Amino acid sequence: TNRSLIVTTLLEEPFVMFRKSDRTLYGNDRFEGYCIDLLKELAHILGFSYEIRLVEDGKYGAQDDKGQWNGMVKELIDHKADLAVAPLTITHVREKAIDFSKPFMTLGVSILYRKGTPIDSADDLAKQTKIEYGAVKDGATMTFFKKSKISTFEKMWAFMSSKPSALVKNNEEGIQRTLTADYALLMESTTIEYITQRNCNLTQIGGLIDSKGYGIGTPMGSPYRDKITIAILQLQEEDKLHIMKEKWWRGSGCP
Amino acid sequence: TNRSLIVTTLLEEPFVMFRKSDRTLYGNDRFEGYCIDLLKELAHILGFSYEIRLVEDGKYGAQDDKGQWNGMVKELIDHKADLAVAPLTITHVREKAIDFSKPFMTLGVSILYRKGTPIDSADDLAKQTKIEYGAVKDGATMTFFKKSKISTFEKMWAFMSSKPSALVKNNEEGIQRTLTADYALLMESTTIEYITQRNCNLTQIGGLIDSKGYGIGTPMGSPYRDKITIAILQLQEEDKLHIMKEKWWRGSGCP
Numbered sequence: 001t002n003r004s005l006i007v008t009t010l011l012e013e014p015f016v017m018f019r020k021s022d023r024t025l026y027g028n029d030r031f032e033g034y035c036i037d038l039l040k041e042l043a044h045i046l047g048f049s050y051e052i053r054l055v056e057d058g059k060y061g062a063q064d065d066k067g068q069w070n071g072m073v074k075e076l077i078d079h080k081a082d083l084a085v086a087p088l089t090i091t092h093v094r095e096k097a098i099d100f101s102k103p104f105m106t107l108g109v110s111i112l113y114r115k116g117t118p119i120d121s122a123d124d125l126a127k128q129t130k131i132e133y134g135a136v137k138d139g140a141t142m143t144f145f146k147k148s149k150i151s152t153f154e155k156m157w158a159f160m161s162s163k164p165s166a167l168v169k170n171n172e173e174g175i176q177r178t179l180t181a182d183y184a185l186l187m188e189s190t191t192i193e194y195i196t197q198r199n200c201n202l203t204q205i206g207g208l209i210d211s212k213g214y215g216i217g218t219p220m221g222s223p224y225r226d227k228i229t230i231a232i233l234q235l236q237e238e239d240k241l242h243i244m245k246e247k248w249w250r251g252s253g254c255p
Numbered sequence: 256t257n258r259s260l261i262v263t264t265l266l267e268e269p270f271v272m273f274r275k276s277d278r279t280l281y282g283n284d285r286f287e288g289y290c291i292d293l294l295k296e297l298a299h300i301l302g303f304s305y306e307i308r309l310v311e312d313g314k315y316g317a318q319d320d321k322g323q324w325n326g327m328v329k330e331l332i333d334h335k336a337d338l339a340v341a342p343l344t345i346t347h348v349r350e351k352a353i354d355f356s357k358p359f360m361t362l363g364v365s366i367l368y369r370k371g372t373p374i375d376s377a378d379d380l381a382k383q384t385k386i387e388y389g390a391v392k393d394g395a396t397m398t399f400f401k402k403s404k405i406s407t408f409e410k411m412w413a414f415m416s417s418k419p420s421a422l423v424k425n426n427e428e429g430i431q432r433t434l435t436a437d438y439a440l441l442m443e444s445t446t447i448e449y450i451t452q453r454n455c456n457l458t459q460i461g462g463l464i465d466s467k468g469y470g471i472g473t474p475m476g477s478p479y480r481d482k483i484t485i486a487i488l489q490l491q492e493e494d495k496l497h498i499m500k501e502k503w504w505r506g507s508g509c510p
């Protein structure tokens with residue numbers, strides 16, 4: 001009741017990153033970003049402490065065809081962490097196994113690609129194969145496509161699940177692929193927004209395919225979830241999260 | 256901590272219905288259905304009691320353009336009820352203001368219409384005006400269309416929000432309209448499944464437009480939400496909810 005909460009997370013700019021330093025860092029001090037700021041603010045408000053640990057398999061979390069979970073979702077299921085502090089998408093399938101705080105950020109799935117394509121929608125992607133496309137493996141975006149019954153997205157998932165190379169390990173690998181190949185990444189929109197201010201030859205293709213939130217993950221029936229939710233709620237009324245988003249998204253202009 | 260919880264709900268076959276009787280009924284005894292069975296099972300498991308009350312405005316809940324809520328969602332926000340026990344759709348927009356148990360049922364938005372139309376998808380509906388279409392006013396389905404950035408659904412919401420008659424007060428009014436007019440109802444799929452076993456000239460058009468869950472609503476930071484969630488979780492592992500669904504959905508065959 002006073003012990004430090006175990007926080008599971010993974011590296012994802014600009015939510016969670018290794019901060020820069022000449023010396024070798026350790027413990028919580030290794031980390032910085034939007035999600036680290038949020039965590040600090042919550043811990044201040046609620047008077048708790050924590051130890052940050054990186055999820056070993058580097059995954060957000062998905063269920064294989066035998067109902068077995070992995071990634072951060074699994075860490076929460078097994079109660080190996082008290083919180084998942086990351087851009088962890090709140091979804092219907094995940095809510096069957098774990099709980100989430102109220103949403104701290106709104107986003108939707110869209111498309112990341114190089115500038116200068118006739119392609120202007122998911123429809124255009126789905127009806128060709130010249131431009132390859134995919135998504136991060138074992139996260140919310142993959143799961144969305146795998147479960148969709150909308151024809152366009154059904155065809156896209158038919159393609160994705162057929163190409164072994166098409167699913168990337170993480171956003172970073174995906175972004176690198178869009179820069180070095182004829183490849184479009186299905187990516188969440190807040191990240192696209194951050195990436196396209198920095199890599200000036202990349203852009204969002206089309207609009208948002210859905211609308212959903214990020215939440216702090218907890219094991220189902222966690223005693224910390226509600227107070228975190230209330231803490232988040234108050235930060236939001238004074239627009240603290242908006243400000244915090246600006247701090248980590250602001251910067252690099254484009255020609 | 257031992258008082259009876261206030262349960263808000265509304266009439267919606269076959270989740271919540273007035274049971275049949277020669278005499279005049281009162282209190283909890285007035286009600287029966289899938290959601291009443293679920294509630295009873297939960298109250299048995301967790302040892303709580305309750306008073307069922309019908310939400311006055313007969314709405315599930317939506318936010319007007321000034322951020323003001325209504326329906327059962329409002330009842331929970333104002334803490335006038337401890338639980339919303341109904342087919343209350345868990346959504347991202349609602350999770351900003353209230354909390355939900357883990358999902359007790361999976362559903363998606365689809366289309367209800369009379370048999371024998373060339374129309375076989377939302378795409379076909381959206382590209383004509385002969386067949387009118389709409390949804391229950393101030394619920395999850397309406398909100399989905401109002402917030403969608405998918406072109407087809409954007410056009411549909413353009414139509415819906417232009418016709419004053421197009422949004423119905425509730426599913427029942429909507430179903431009656433499909434029987435008496437050239438009108439298709441955007442409706443949740445579990446209800447379509449129940450309706451089409453009974454009204455043999457009605458049918459689902461197309462597939463599921465999304466995938467989401469029903470949840471028992473609570474005020475944000477309710478102390479009862481977690482135990483209800485765990486109770487639901489255990490019922491699910493022994494397939495009690497599947498059985499309960501069969502009990503209320505089973506019956507009337509079709510030629």
Ligand SMILES: N[C@H](C(=O)O)[C@@H]1CC[C@@H]1C(=O)O
Pocket residue numbers: 060061087088089090136138139140141142171186187188
């Ligand atoms: N927010 C997502 C999740 O919770 O799974 C992550 C971002 C990469 C991955 C994805 O896009 O699916």
Ligand SMILES: N[C@H](C(=O)O)[C@@H]1CC[C@@H]1C(=O)O
Pocket residue numbers: 315316342343344345391393394395396397426441442443
């Ligand atoms: N489950 C929905 C809700 O929670 O708002 C109800 C069903 C009619 C209405 C709707 O379809 O939008």
Ligand SMILES: [Cl-]
Pocket residue numbers: 052053054
């Ligand atoms: Cl670590």
Ligand SMILES: [Cl-]
Pocket residue numbers: 235236237238239240241242243
């Ligand atoms: Cl904010």
Ligand SMILES: [Cl-]
Pocket residue numbers: 307308309
């Ligand atoms: Cl009443």
Ligand SMILES: [Cl-]
Pocket residue numbers: 490491492493494495496497498
């Ligand atoms: Cl079940």
Ligand SMILES: [K+]
Pocket residue numbers: 020021022023024025
């Ligand atoms: K260093």
Ligand SMILES: [K+]
Pocket residue numbers: 002003004047048049
């Ligand atoms: K402490």
Ligand SMILES: [K+]
Pocket residue numbers: 275276277278279280
């Ligand atoms: K009676």
Ligand SMILES: [K+]
Pocket residue numbers: 257258259302303304
């Ligand atoms: K009691």
